[PDB]
Design a protein around this ligand. Sequence first.
Ligand SMILES: [Mg+2]
Ligand SMILES: [Mg+2]
Ligand SMILES: [Mg+2]
Ligand SMILES: [Mg+2]
Ligand SMILES: [Mg+2]
Ligand SMILES: [Mg+2]
Ligand SMILES: [Mg+2]
Ligand SMILES: [Mg+2]
Ligand SMILES: [Mg+2]
Ligand SMILES: [Mg+2]
Ligand SMILES: [Mg+2]
Ligand SMILES: [Mg+2]
Ligand SMILES: [Mg+2]
Ligand SMILES: [Mg+2]
Ligand SMILES: [Mg+2]
Ligand SMILES: [Mg+2]
Ligand SMILES: [Mg+2]
Ligand SMILES: [Mg+2]
Ligand SMILES: [Mg+2]
Ligand SMILES: [Mg+2]
Ligand SMILES: [Mg+2]
Ligand SMILES: [Mg+2]
Ligand SMILES: [Mg+2]
Ligand SMILES: [Mg+2]
Ligand SMILES: [Mg+2]
Ligand SMILES: [Mg+2]
Ligand SMILES: [Mg+2]
Ligand SMILES: [Mg+2]
Ligand SMILES: [Mg+2]
Ligand SMILES: [Mg+2]
Ligand SMILES: [Mg+2]
Ligand SMILES: [Mg+2]
Ligand SMILES: [Mg+2]
Ligand SMILES: [Mg+2]
Ligand SMILES: [Mg+2]
Ligand SMILES: [Mg+2]
Ligand SMILES: [Mg+2]
Ligand SMILES: [Mg+2]
Ligand SMILES: [Mg+2]
Ligand SMILES: [Mg+2]
Ligand SMILES: [Mg+2]
Ligand SMILES: [Mg+2]
Ligand SMILES: [Mg+2]
Ligand SMILES: [Mg+2]
Ligand SMILES: [Mg+2]
Ligand SMILES: [Mg+2]
Ligand SMILES: [Mg+2]
Ligand SMILES: [Mg+2]
Ligand SMILES: [Mg+2]
Ligand SMILES: [Mg+2]
Ligand SMILES: [Mg+2]
Ligand SMILES: [Mg+2]
Ligand SMILES: [Mg+2]
Ligand SMILES: [Mg+2]
Ligand SMILES: [Mg+2]
Ligand SMILES: [Mg+2]
Ligand SMILES: [Mg+2]
Ligand SMILES: [Mg+2]
Ligand SMILES: [Mg+2]
Ligand SMILES: [Mg+2]
Ligand SMILES: [Mg+2]
Ligand SMILES: [Mg+2]
Ligand SMILES: [Mg+2]
Ligand SMILES: [Mg+2]
Ligand SMILES: [Mg+2]
Ligand SMILES: [Mg+2]
Ligand SMILES: [Mg+2]
Ligand SMILES: [Mg+2]
Ligand SMILES: [Mg+2]
Ligand SMILES: [Mg+2]
Ligand SMILES: [Mg+2]
Ligand SMILES: [Mg+2]
Ligand SMILES: [Mg+2]
Ligand SMILES: [Mg+2]
Ligand SMILES: [Mg+2]
Ligand SMILES: [Mg+2]
Ligand SMILES: [Mg+2]
Ligand SMILES: [Mg+2]
Ligand SMILES: [Mg+2]
Ligand SMILES: [Mg+2]
Ligand SMILES: [Mg+2]
Ligand SMILES: [Mg+2]
Ligand SMILES: [Mg+2]
Ligand SMILES: [Mg+2]
Ligand SMILES: [Mg+2]
Ligand SMILES: [Mg+2]
Ligand SMILES: [Mg+2]
Ligand SMILES: [Mg+2]
Ligand SMILES: [Mg+2]
Ligand SMILES: [Mg+2]
Ligand SMILES: [Mg+2]
Ligand SMILES: [Mg+2]
Ligand SMILES: [Mg+2]
Ligand SMILES: [Mg+2]
Ligand SMILES: [Mg+2]
Ligand SMILES: [Mg+2]
Ligand SMILES: [Mg+2]
Ligand SMILES: [Mg+2]
Ligand SMILES: [Mg+2]
Ligand SMILES: [Mg+2]
Ligand SMILES: [Mg+2]
Ligand SMILES: [Mg+2]
Ligand SMILES: [Mg+2]
Ligand SMILES: [Mg+2]
Ligand SMILES: [Mg+2]
Ligand SMILES: [Mg+2]
Ligand SMILES: [Mg+2]
Ligand SMILES: [Mg+2]
Ligand SMILES: [Mg+2]
Ligand SMILES: [Mg+2]
Ligand SMILES: [Mg+2]
Ligand SMILES: [Mg+2]
Ligand SMILES: [Mg+2]
Ligand SMILES: [Mg+2]
Ligand SMILES: [Mg+2]
Ligand SMILES: [Mg+2]
Ligand SMILES: [Mg+2]
Ligand SMILES: [Mg+2]
Ligand SMILES: [Mg+2]
Ligand SMILES: [Mg+2]
Ligand SMILES: [Mg+2]
Ligand SMILES: [Mg+2]
Ligand SMILES: [Mg+2]
Ligand SMILES: [Mg+2]
Ligand SMILES: [Mg+2]
Ligand SMILES: [Mg+2]
Ligand SMILES: [Mg+2]
Ligand SMILES: [Mg+2]
Ligand SMILES: [Mg+2]
Ligand SMILES: [Mg+2]
Ligand SMILES: [Mg+2]
Ligand SMILES: [Mg+2]
Ligand SMILES: [Mg+2]
Ligand SMILES: [Mg+2]
Ligand SMILES: [Mg+2]
Ligand SMILES: [Mg+2]
Ligand SMILES: [Mg+2]
Ligand SMILES: [Mg+2]
Ligand SMILES: [Mg+2]
Ligand SMILES: [Mg+2]
Ligand SMILES: [Mg+2]
Ligand SMILES: [Mg+2]
Ligand SMILES: [Mg+2]
Ligand SMILES: [Mg+2]
Ligand SMILES: [Mg+2]
Ligand SMILES: [Mg+2]
Ligand SMILES: [Mg+2]
Ligand SMILES: [Mg+2]
Ligand SMILES: [Mg+2]
Ligand SMILES: [Mg+2]
Ligand SMILES: [Mg+2]
Ligand SMILES: [Mg+2]
Ligand SMILES: [Mg+2]
Ligand SMILES: [Mg+2]
Ligand SMILES: [Mg+2]
Ligand SMILES: [Mg+2]
Ligand SMILES: [Mg+2]
Ligand SMILES: [Mg+2]
Ligand SMILES: [Mg+2]
Ligand SMILES: [Mg+2]
Ligand SMILES: [Mg+2]
Ligand SMILES: [Mg+2]
Ligand SMILES: [Mg+2]
Ligand SMILES: [Mg+2]
Ligand SMILES: [Mg+2]
Ligand SMILES: [Mg+2]
Ligand SMILES: [Mg+2]
Ligand SMILES: [Mg+2]
Ligand SMILES: [Mg+2]
Ligand SMILES: [Mg+2]
Ligand SMILES: [Mg+2]
Ligand SMILES: [Mg+2]
Ligand SMILES: [Mg+2]
Ligand SMILES: [Mg+2]
Ligand SMILES: [Mg+2]
Ligand SMILES: [Mg+2]
Ligand SMILES: [Mg+2]
Ligand SMILES: [Mg+2]
Ligand SMILES: [Mg+2]
Ligand SMILES: [Mg+2]
Ligand SMILES: [Mg+2]
Ligand SMILES: [Mg+2]
Ligand SMILES: [Mg+2]
Ligand SMILES: [Mg+2]
Ligand SMILES: [Mg+2]
Ligand SMILES: [Mg+2]
Ligand SMILES: [Mg+2]
Ligand SMILES: [Mg+2]
Ligand SMILES: [Mg+2]
Ligand SMILES: [Mg+2]
Ligand SMILES: [Mg+2]
Ligand SMILES: [Mg+2]
Ligand SMILES: [Mg+2]
Ligand SMILES: [Mg+2]
Ligand SMILES: [Zn+2]
Lengths: 95, 107, 97, 70
Amino acid sequence: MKTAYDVILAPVLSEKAYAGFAEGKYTFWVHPKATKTEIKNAVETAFKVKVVKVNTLHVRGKKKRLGRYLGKRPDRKKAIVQVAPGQKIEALEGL
Amino acid sequence: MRVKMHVKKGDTVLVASGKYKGRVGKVKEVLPKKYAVIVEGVNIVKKAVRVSPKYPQGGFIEKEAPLHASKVRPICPACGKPTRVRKKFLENGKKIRVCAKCGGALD
Amino acid sequence: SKVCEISGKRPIVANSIQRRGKAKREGGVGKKTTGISKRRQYPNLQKVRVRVAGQEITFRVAASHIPKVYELVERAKGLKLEGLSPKEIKKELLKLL
Amino acid sequence: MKLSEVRKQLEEARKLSPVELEKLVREKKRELMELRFQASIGQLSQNHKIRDLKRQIARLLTVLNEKRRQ
RNA sequence: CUCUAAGCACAACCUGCGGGAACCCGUACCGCAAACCGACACAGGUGGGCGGGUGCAAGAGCACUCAGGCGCGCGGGAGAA
RNA sequence: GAAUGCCGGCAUGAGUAACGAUAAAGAGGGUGAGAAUCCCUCUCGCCGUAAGCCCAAGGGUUCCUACGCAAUGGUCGUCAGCGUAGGGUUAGGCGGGACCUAAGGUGAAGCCGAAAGGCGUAGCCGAAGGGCAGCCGGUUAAUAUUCCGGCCCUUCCCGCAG
RNA sequence: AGCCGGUAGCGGGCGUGGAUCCCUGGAUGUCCGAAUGGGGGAACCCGGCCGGCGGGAACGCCGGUCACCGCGCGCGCGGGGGGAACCUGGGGAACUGAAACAUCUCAGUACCCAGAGGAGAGGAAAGAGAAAUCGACUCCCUGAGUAGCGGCGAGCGAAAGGGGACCAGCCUAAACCGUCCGGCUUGUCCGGGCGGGGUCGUGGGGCCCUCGGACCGAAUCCCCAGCCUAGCCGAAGCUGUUGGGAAGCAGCGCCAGAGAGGGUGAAAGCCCCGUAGGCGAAAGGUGGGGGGAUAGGUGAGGGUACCCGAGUACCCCGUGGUUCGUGGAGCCAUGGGGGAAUCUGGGCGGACCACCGCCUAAGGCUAAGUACUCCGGGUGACCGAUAGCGCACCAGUAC
Ligand SMILES: [Mg+2]
Ligand SMILES: [Mg+2]
Ligand SMILES: [Mg+2]
Ligand SMILES: [Mg+2]
Ligand SMILES: [Mg+2]
Ligand SMILES: [Mg+2]
Ligand SMILES: [Mg+2]
Ligand SMILES: [Mg+2]
Ligand SMILES: [Mg+2]
Ligand SMILES: [Mg+2]
Ligand SMILES: [Mg+2]
Ligand SMILES: [Mg+2]
Ligand SMILES: [Mg+2]
Ligand SMILES: [Mg+2]
Ligand SMILES: [Mg+2]
Ligand SMILES: [Mg+2]
Ligand SMILES: [Mg+2]
Ligand SMILES: [Mg+2]
Ligand SMILES: [Mg+2]
Ligand SMILES: [Mg+2]
Ligand SMILES: [Mg+2]
Ligand SMILES: [Mg+2]
Ligand SMILES: [Mg+2]
Ligand SMILES: [Mg+2]
Ligand SMILES: [Mg+2]
Ligand SMILES: [Mg+2]
Ligand SMILES: [Mg+2]
Ligand SMILES: [Mg+2]
Ligand SMILES: [Mg+2]
Ligand SMILES: [Mg+2]
Ligand SMILES: [Mg+2]
Ligand SMILES: [Mg+2]
Ligand SMILES: [Mg+2]
Ligand SMILES: [Mg+2]
Ligand SMILES: [Mg+2]
Ligand SMILES: [Mg+2]
Ligand SMILES: [Mg+2]
Ligand SMILES: [Mg+2]
Ligand SMILES: [Mg+2]
Ligand SMILES: [Mg+2]
Ligand SMILES: [Mg+2]
Ligand SMILES: [Mg+2]
Ligand SMILES: [Mg+2]
Ligand SMILES: [Mg+2]
Ligand SMILES: [Mg+2]
Ligand SMILES: [Mg+2]
Ligand SMILES: [Mg+2]
Ligand SMILES: [Mg+2]
Ligand SMILES: [Mg+2]
Ligand SMILES: [Mg+2]
Ligand SMILES: [Mg+2]
Ligand SMILES: [Mg+2]
Ligand SMILES: [Mg+2]
Ligand SMILES: [Mg+2]
Ligand SMILES: [Mg+2]
Ligand SMILES: [Mg+2]
Ligand SMILES: [Mg+2]
Ligand SMILES: [Mg+2]
Ligand SMILES: [Mg+2]
Ligand SMILES: [Mg+2]
Ligand SMILES: [Mg+2]
Ligand SMILES: [Mg+2]
Ligand SMILES: [Mg+2]
Ligand SMILES: [Mg+2]
Ligand SMILES: [Mg+2]
Ligand SMILES: [Mg+2]
Ligand SMILES: [Mg+2]
Ligand SMILES: [Mg+2]
Ligand SMILES: [Mg+2]
Ligand SMILES: [Mg+2]
Ligand SMILES: [Mg+2]
Ligand SMILES: [Mg+2]
Ligand SMILES: [Mg+2]
Ligand SMILES: [Mg+2]
Ligand SMILES: [Mg+2]
Ligand SMILES: [Mg+2]
Ligand SMILES: [Mg+2]
Ligand SMILES: [Mg+2]
Ligand SMILES: [Mg+2]
Ligand SMILES: [Mg+2]
Ligand SMILES: [Mg+2]
Ligand SMILES: [Mg+2]
Ligand SMILES: [Mg+2]
Ligand SMILES: [Mg+2]
Ligand SMILES: [Mg+2]
Ligand SMILES: [Mg+2]
Ligand SMILES: [Mg+2]
Ligand SMILES: [Mg+2]
Ligand SMILES: [Mg+2]
Ligand SMILES: [Mg+2]
Ligand SMILES: [Mg+2]
Ligand SMILES: [Mg+2]
Ligand SMILES: [Mg+2]
Ligand SMILES: [Mg+2]
Ligand SMILES: [Mg+2]
Ligand SMILES: [Mg+2]
Ligand SMILES: [Mg+2]
Ligand SMILES: [Mg+2]
Ligand SMILES: [Mg+2]
Ligand SMILES: [Mg+2]
Ligand SMILES: [Mg+2]
Ligand SMILES: [Mg+2]
Ligand SMILES: [Mg+2]
Ligand SMILES: [Mg+2]
Ligand SMILES: [Mg+2]
Ligand SMILES: [Mg+2]
Ligand SMILES: [Mg+2]
Ligand SMILES: [Mg+2]
Ligand SMILES: [Mg+2]
Ligand SMILES: [Mg+2]
Ligand SMILES: [Mg+2]
Ligand SMILES: [Mg+2]
Ligand SMILES: [Mg+2]
Ligand SMILES: [Mg+2]
Ligand SMILES: [Mg+2]
Ligand SMILES: [Mg+2]
Ligand SMILES: [Mg+2]
Ligand SMILES: [Mg+2]
Ligand SMILES: [Mg+2]
Ligand SMILES: [Mg+2]
Ligand SMILES: [Mg+2]
Ligand SMILES: [Mg+2]
Ligand SMILES: [Mg+2]
Ligand SMILES: [Mg+2]
Ligand SMILES: [Mg+2]
Ligand SMILES: [Mg+2]
Ligand SMILES: [Mg+2]
Ligand SMILES: [Mg+2]
Ligand SMILES: [Mg+2]
Ligand SMILES: [Mg+2]
Ligand SMILES: [Mg+2]
Ligand SMILES: [Mg+2]
Ligand SMILES: [Mg+2]
Ligand SMILES: [Mg+2]
Ligand SMILES: [Mg+2]
Ligand SMILES: [Mg+2]
Ligand SMILES: [Mg+2]
Ligand SMILES: [Mg+2]
Ligand SMILES: [Mg+2]
Ligand SMILES: [Mg+2]
Ligand SMILES: [Mg+2]
Ligand SMILES: [Mg+2]
Ligand SMILES: [Mg+2]
Ligand SMILES: [Mg+2]
Ligand SMILES: [Mg+2]
Ligand SMILES: [Mg+2]
Ligand SMILES: [Mg+2]
Ligand SMILES: [Mg+2]
Ligand SMILES: [Mg+2]
Ligand SMILES: [Mg+2]
Ligand SMILES: [Mg+2]
Ligand SMILES: [Mg+2]
Ligand SMILES: [Mg+2]
Ligand SMILES: [Mg+2]
Ligand SMILES: [Mg+2]
Ligand SMILES: [Mg+2]
Ligand SMILES: [Mg+2]
Ligand SMILES: [Mg+2]
Ligand SMILES: [Mg+2]
Ligand SMILES: [Mg+2]
Ligand SMILES: [Mg+2]
Ligand SMILES: [Mg+2]
Ligand SMILES: [Mg+2]
Ligand SMILES: [Mg+2]
Ligand SMILES: [Mg+2]
Ligand SMILES: [Mg+2]
Ligand SMILES: [Mg+2]
Ligand SMILES: [Mg+2]
Ligand SMILES: [Mg+2]
Ligand SMILES: [Mg+2]
Ligand SMILES: [Mg+2]
Ligand SMILES: [Mg+2]
Ligand SMILES: [Mg+2]
Ligand SMILES: [Mg+2]
Ligand SMILES: [Mg+2]
Ligand SMILES: [Mg+2]
Ligand SMILES: [Mg+2]
Ligand SMILES: [Mg+2]
Ligand SMILES: [Mg+2]
Ligand SMILES: [Mg+2]
Ligand SMILES: [Mg+2]
Ligand SMILES: [Mg+2]
Ligand SMILES: [Mg+2]
Ligand SMILES: [Mg+2]
Ligand SMILES: [Mg+2]
Ligand SMILES: [Mg+2]
Ligand SMILES: [Mg+2]
Ligand SMILES: [Mg+2]
Ligand SMILES: [Mg+2]
Ligand SMILES: [Mg+2]
Ligand SMILES: [Mg+2]
Ligand SMILES: [Mg+2]
Ligand SMILES: [Mg+2]
Ligand SMILES: [Mg+2]
Ligand SMILES: [Zn+2]
């Protein structure tokens, strides 16, 4: 059955995602089929926050090889949610 | 369906062929995939090891080599002789391995 | 150039044979075929429009079975048909086939 | 997860109402996400726990589906 | 924008103000080219817009030069036919 | 043993022709096992209705960074559009869709054809045409009319007033 | 009794409270695809209705539902598409052969299309054709390269009969009777439904009189055996010697309904896996065999002359099929034209006529014996990496 924890996969662990913690923009990897509105509700019921702004982008899987064998990494999608003034998602503040 | 094993960890077996013919040992491990067993203190090989956290200073280590399962025979914990294995149906009616020389259980 | 709704008469394939000479029967050397090719012999379809339950129904029918369209109309008197479309009525007639 | 514990999970699972089942899944689904996050930062050495929870959620839903289907 | 028809005229529409709501896909990099079409890091081919200054009658011509970009992925000598 | 036979391997021509625009180089300094060939500086030369810059097509990670040099690079290589890894593409207003139609395509009604199928007013699809609301600056190694700053605007839902 | 696939490693777990694994049934099954809410450049996009989720009216997500066509009184059942060959049907070449070429051949082949199905077609005589005879059909052998066909060239090429495989026969239409329904030209009406009756070639049936009053039995259904989809039991050897290694050699034994074959450090009946001989299914599939039910099946005379499949038979024109190419050209089929009869009817026995026989057209169905090999197994005087499938290897791939 579909829940919020099915929509949010893992947080984005990179120098650029960290920079957004300062201003309350958190960055998660999300399921590629999930809508902005869908991602809003999900982060909200997951972390008890108020989502004011959601920006999403797709990330192509990098093509890689093992000697003889050419292949592709799974395609991903990340979302950057803006929580309300003063709010925080502590789990990601982690760091 | 599954490989037939007349021997298992860790009943006692005679090595009846090869360089260790006649030795007796416990079945340390059974590798059904390769159809081979590991018999304690039998088939010792010298393997080289790189200097590591595992083996600093390094050099060599002694290891037991796998033996073709056919080269090994279980010993009867009753009569004490090397034997072939039979099967026997109990009243349960589960089946057990039994010695062919005497009717001993072999577990 | 098509199919008889009543009889199923269809276009068929026939040969057109070309012959020279005098038949043996009339004292001749014999008939030689100077050509054969395929051709089609079509049914003789015509339109048959009849009014049935106050509706206009039309049939594509080989001339041979033209009166068979009327026998249907005659047989169609025992059926409650009024109010239907011509498409439906035609199906009902054809069921009497 | 242990065999005996599986049987035990099933007995107690089959006694729940759908709603209790639905609620139970949601939590174990939430725990899966919690596991995934720590897995991300290399802070989950007992990684077998991930496979384990996935199958619990599976076993629950299978039973949720049991409850509804006849 | 306007006109009316079924309808509806506690509805409906227009205007002003407020609060709320606003999804999916693209966006990296080359792009007159070593990243496109030509089997090649190929003197070929590829649509649109910007394209400064001075001088030469004009100009998108021509010479030099701005910003910007390059010296073209083998070199060193010799000084014959 | 021959079929200008077939598949493969290895010779000869031969250290020969060539190394792909005659825009052009020189030195110093640095790095490194190794440097004409990578980085840095200075000097010299070439393009400038381009050999600069921005869009569309097409290509599809080639982008940025770290670590590398077997092969790819017509030489060399410490460099690279190359190997490994990690990072990177953020929109109600830009482009396309939730709008419109063009040739054409498809196609209720209807017509036609052995079968397969061919047609066909309406409608539907179809765009680089019509239509529609964002401008300037800052920030990143790498994105920006997308994030941030400032000042603006659009549609939809509900309410209130006229 | 090990296990977490090929796959070891890091990092962690599971199993005699029966894991891994194998078989059966079930659950889940994103998106596209017949693809079916609509659109579309397949795997993307966009909607209606009902119900749910969020603060939720806008926005979004979840669940269900919504294409078209056919048949049957909005609702139901069905249809669609795929499958290596095999099958039927609707279309249908050419090279080539004729030592040129046109009739002819290749060949109703290749191929296209439509439909079937585990098969398909065909099938219970309007047959054969001379036997005073046979008796559905299919399939093999023979008949026979015969009879014939043929620019009587090249070539093409049957059937009856005989030997076999298998075996099986049925349901309707019409007369007449009954009932529901509707028509307008009111009933002894015409017609359409459903039921009863009826199914034949020694002709049969309907109707009317006389007499006569349980055996069969499915191709349907149910049960069962048997089989398939995992499996299990399974006789008999030790010591020495050479050698890295015994299964070689030596010595002394032993099994055999098992001495097929593969393995194990070399060459093993007795070490392993097997083999001979046996055993095995809760579940699903099958079930042509065994049992049982059910549908269905069943008299004889005399009279009557009601019925016995229509644009049909039949004749003529144009063709195809057959061995038959226009030939003395019948037969079967039918595109055009003309156009009957119901047993004192009609077709056939190679123009036609007579005599003599055979057969019952114009409705439908029907196992088995036959074809093929995507798939599983068994066996080779079959290949052994240029061979064998294009592929022994991550191949319909790279290119
Ligand atoms: Mg689900
Ligand atoms: Mg940064
Ligand atoms: Mg909220
Ligand atoms: Mg976006
Ligand atoms: Mg992957
Ligand atoms: Mg076993
Ligand atoms: Mg030995
Ligand atoms: Mg010994
Ligand atoms: Mg058991
Ligand atoms: Mg003619
Ligand atoms: Mg003649
Ligand atoms: Mg004469
Ligand atoms: Mg002739
Ligand atoms: Mg007329
Ligand atoms: Mg006619
Ligand atoms: Mg006529
Ligand atoms: Mg389990
Ligand atoms: Mg009104
Ligand atoms: Mg007004
Ligand atoms: Mg407003
Ligand atoms: Mg949408
Ligand atoms: Mg997007
Ligand atoms: Mg961009
Ligand atoms: Mg850009
Ligand atoms: Mg470039
Ligand atoms: Mg550029
Ligand atoms: Mg040019
Ligand atoms: Mg240009
Ligand atoms: Mg350029
Ligand atoms: Mg070229
Ligand atoms: Mg190129
Ligand atoms: Mg070429
Ligand atoms: Mg190229
Ligand atoms: Mg170059
Ligand atoms: Mg070029
Ligand atoms: Mg040009
Ligand atoms: Mg100028
Ligand atoms: Mg001057
Ligand atoms: Mg001037
Ligand atoms: Mg001048
Ligand atoms: Mg001038
Ligand atoms: Mg000029
Ligand atoms: Mg110029
Ligand atoms: Mg110049
Ligand atoms: Mg200047
Ligand atoms: Mg400069
Ligand atoms: Mg140069
Ligand atoms: Mg240079
Ligand atoms: Mg010289
Ligand atoms: Mg020779
Ligand atoms: Mg040559
Ligand atoms: Mg040669
Ligand atoms: Mg020569
Ligand atoms: Mg050759
Ligand atoms: Mg040769
Ligand atoms: Mg060759
Ligand atoms: Mg060669
Ligand atoms: Mg050479
Ligand atoms: Mg020289
Ligand atoms: Mg020379
Ligand atoms: Mg020379
Ligand atoms: Mg060259
Ligand atoms: Mg030279
Ligand atoms: Mg050059
Ligand atoms: Mg040069
Ligand atoms: Mg020049
Ligand atoms: Mg230098
Ligand atoms: Mg230097
Ligand atoms: Mg260098
Ligand atoms: Mg160097
Ligand atoms: Mg430099
Ligand atoms: Mg200029
Ligand atoms: Mg693009
Ligand atoms: Mg390319
Ligand atoms: Mg690459
Ligand atoms: Mg970039
Ligand atoms: Mg890169
Ligand atoms: Mg670069
Ligand atoms: Mg570097
Ligand atoms: Mg290199
Ligand atoms: Mg080198
Ligand atoms: Mg390397
Ligand atoms: Mg190279
Ligand atoms: Mg090189
Ligand atoms: Mg080159
Ligand atoms: Mg090198
Ligand atoms: Mg270096
Ligand atoms: Mg490069
Ligand atoms: Mg790189
Ligand atoms: Mg904005
Ligand atoms: Mg919408
Ligand atoms: Mg549109
Ligand atoms: Mg439109
Ligand atoms: Mg069309
Ligand atoms: Mg079709
Ligand atoms: Mg049109
Ligand atoms: Mg529209
Ligand atoms: Mg459009
Ligand atoms: Mg447009
Ligand atoms: Mg436009
Ligand atoms: Mg716009
Ligand atoms: Mg738009
Ligand atoms: Mg503005
Ligand atoms: Mg940039
Ligand atoms: Mg950036
Ligand atoms: Mg802004
Ligand atoms: Mg008001
Ligand atoms: Mg693995
Ligand atoms: Mg470990
Ligand atoms: Mg059990
Ligand atoms: Mg299953
Ligand atoms: Mg689908
Ligand atoms: Mg669809
Ligand atoms: Mg829907
Ligand atoms: Mg469609
Ligand atoms: Mg709703
Ligand atoms: Mg809601
Ligand atoms: Mg939701
Ligand atoms: Mg839905
Ligand atoms: Mg079909
Ligand atoms: Mg089909
Ligand atoms: Mg045919
Ligand atoms: Mg057809
Ligand atoms: Mg034909
Ligand atoms: Mg043709
Ligand atoms: Mg010919
Ligand atoms: Mg030929
Ligand atoms: Mg010949
Ligand atoms: Mg010829
Ligand atoms: Mg010839
Ligand atoms: Mg010729
Ligand atoms: Mg010819
Ligand atoms: Mg031939
Ligand atoms: Mg023929
Ligand atoms: Mg055919
Ligand atoms: Mg064929
Ligand atoms: Mg089909
Ligand atoms: Mg069969
Ligand atoms: Mg059949
Ligand atoms: Mg019959
Ligand atoms: Mg004979
Ligand atoms: Mg002759
Ligand atoms: Mg023929
Ligand atoms: Mg016969
Ligand atoms: Mg016979
Ligand atoms: Mg037989
Ligand atoms: Mg009647
Ligand atoms: Mg009546
Ligand atoms: Mg009646
Ligand atoms: Mg009679
Ligand atoms: Mg029957
Ligand atoms: Mg055994
Ligand atoms: Mg044995
Ligand atoms: Mg020795
Ligand atoms: Mg021995
Ligand atoms: Mg001996
Ligand atoms: Mg034997
Ligand atoms: Mg043997
Ligand atoms: Mg053997
Ligand atoms: Mg060896
Ligand atoms: Mg021997
Ligand atoms: Mg031998
Ligand atoms: Mg053996
Ligand atoms: Mg047996
Ligand atoms: Mg057996
Ligand atoms: Mg009687
Ligand atoms: Mg009569
Ligand atoms: Mg008859
Ligand atoms: Mg008829
Ligand atoms: Mg006749
Ligand atoms: Mg005729
Ligand atoms: Mg003929
Ligand atoms: Mg003749
Ligand atoms: Mg004839
Ligand atoms: Mg006759
Ligand atoms: Mg005839
Ligand atoms: Mg005719
Ligand atoms: Mg007569
Ligand atoms: Mg007669
Ligand atoms: Mg006849
Ligand atoms: Mg006859
Ligand atoms: Mg005669
Ligand atoms: Mg006859
Ligand atoms: Mg049939
Ligand atoms: Mg049978
Ligand atoms: Mg059959
Ligand atoms: Mg059969
Ligand atoms: Mg096979
Ligand atoms: Mg061999
Ligand atoms: Mg090979
Ligand atoms: Mg091969
Ligand atoms: Mg070899
Ligand atoms: Mg194969
Ligand atoms: Mg390959
Ligand atoms: Zn014993």
